[PDB]
Structure formats: C-alpha cells, structure tokens
C-alpha cells in the first residue's frame with residue numbers, strides 16, 4: 001500500500017494508480033518566466049471568518065485538520081474559480097531537511113514544506129462526488145520557509161505529540177486557519193490533480209506566491225511524527241512529498257505582474 005518509502009514511494013504509484021502518468025498530474029514546477037499574467041483573473045476571496053475546525057488526524061501519510069463542511073462556513077471563491085468551494089481539511093507536506101519538502105517548486109526551488117487547504121465545489125453536493133469532476137476541488141497551496149515562527153501554527157504544533165502514530169486523532173476545535181495565510185494573496189493557477197493516490201484529476205490548483213515563515217522548531221516537530229501505527233516499527237514522517245510531474249499541455253497563469 002502506497003507511501004513515501006524506498007519500495008512504495010511516488011515512482012511506484014502508477015502500478016496501482018495508472019493515472020499517475022496522466023495528462024494533468026500535480027505537483028508541477030512553476031516556471032515564473034513562462035507563467036502568463038492573466039488580467040481576467042479575479043482576486044481570491046478567502047472567507048474563513050466562520051470556520052469550524054473539528055479534529056486533527058494522523059492518517060499515516062500526513063496530519064489533517066478537519067472542518068465542518070455541511071454549511072457555507074469557510075469558503076474559497078473568486079480567483080480562477082466559478083462558484084463556491086468549501087474548506088474540508090488542511091494538511092502539509094514537508095522534508096527531512098529544510099532544503100526540501102514542498103510539492104510545487106518555483107523555478108526549481110524547493111521550500112521546506114507546503115500547506116494545502118482543500119476545498120470542494122458545492123455544486124456537486126459532497127466531497128466524494130466532487131473528486132470525480134474536473135472542477136471538483138480547489139486546493140490553496142502555501143509554501144513554508146524556515147525563519148521566524150508562525151504564531152498561528154503553534155496550536156497545530158503543540159497537539160502533534162497526541163497524534164504521533166497512524167490512526168490517532170485528537171479534538172481540534174476553534175482553530176482559525178486565517179493564521180496560516182501570508183500577507184499577499186497573489187497566486188499562480190493551473191489545472192491539476194490530487195498529489196496522493198488516487199491522484200484524481202479534479203483540482204484547480206491555486207498556489208500563493210508569498211511563502212509563510214515558520215520556525216525551525218515548528219517544522220522539527222512535524223518531523224517527529226510517525227508514518228507507522230503504534231506498536232509498529234518506527235518510521236519518521238518526513239519527505240511526504242510527491243516530486244514535480246510533467247506539465248504537458250497545461251498553462252500556469254499568474255494573477256499578478
């Protein structure tokens with residue numbers, strides 16, 4: 001079963017998930033000199049004031065903070081999107097070292113980690129229906145670089161020892177995801193896929209240009225999580241990132257000049 005290891009990592013996924021070699025796979029390298037400014041792109045509308053986080057889960061691949069998505073509470077609109085997309089979860093991808101960890105790259109630059117805020121298009125009624133549609137999901141990607149601490153990340157950092165191993169969950173209410181955003185909402189956008197199996201080609205990717213800075217201690221505590229379940233051989237949850245995939249017949253558009 002798939003993972004990031006020696007024997008089951010991204011280069012093996014195509015054997016059980018042949019769409020891994022598909023036409024709109026993610027992540028990709030963002031070539032900043034080839035991305036076209038598109039003045040028809042709208043500013044992003046991030047409406048997280050009424051977000052309801054519920055819990056945090058170690059699923060053996062990353063840790064997900066889950067939200068209540070049964071009403072329009074925390075929604076993403078505007079930008080390249082038609083309609084309203086509801087936040088359902090966020091999670092991160094990170095490295096064993098500060099020099100790697102992000103999934104998207106910028107002119108081949110790898111960031112220390114990458115945050116994915118996952119939203120589904122309300123016109124499809126639920127997340128499981130939305131992932132079967134080419135405009136089903138919108139994922140907001142935010143790079144993390146190692147620098148000053150991110151105060152709004154620390155509640156996430158401090159709960160991690162309670163979900164160290166696969167299958168552990170903890171209550172995680174009243175978390176405000178606005179504390180994870182950078183100052184600017186300038187972005188690049190392209191059509192793509194889930195970056196983990198089943199790798200479905202259902203995502204409008206929106207990747208912010210401005211990274212957030214987190215402290216070395218904050219990202220070190222990500223690296224203390226375990227891919228394995230309790231009682232299984234300990235394997236540190238690091239380098240849970242898929243490398244850049246071929247861009248093929250896609251254009252990356254920039255919301256800014």
Ligand SMILES: NS(=O)(=O)c1ccc(NS(=O)(=O)CCNC(=O)Nc2ccc(F)cc2)cc1
Nearest residue numbers: 054064066067068069070088089127128131198
């Ligand atoms: N709003 S809530 O009830 O509290 C709630 C409930 C669950 C979550 N977990 S999740 O975000 O990871 C979505 C996982 N659910 C799926 O259906 N995935 C899937 C993927 C590929 C397929 F092909 C088919 C299904 C978060 C919040």
Ligand SMILES: NS(=O)(=O)c1ccc(NS(=O)(=O)CCNC(=O)Nc2ccc(F)cc2)cc1
Nearest residue numbers: 026059089116117118139193194195196197203
């Ligand atoms: N890295 S990314 O592109 O942003 C990305 C990658 C994958 C997802 N999918 S997910 O939200 O569901 C989290 C994964 N967990 C499951 O799918 N669980 C599940 C539960 C019940 C089922 F019936 C089937 C599956 C979202 C964003």
Ligand SMILES: [Zn+2]
Nearest residue numbers: 091093116195
């Ligand atoms: Zn992700």
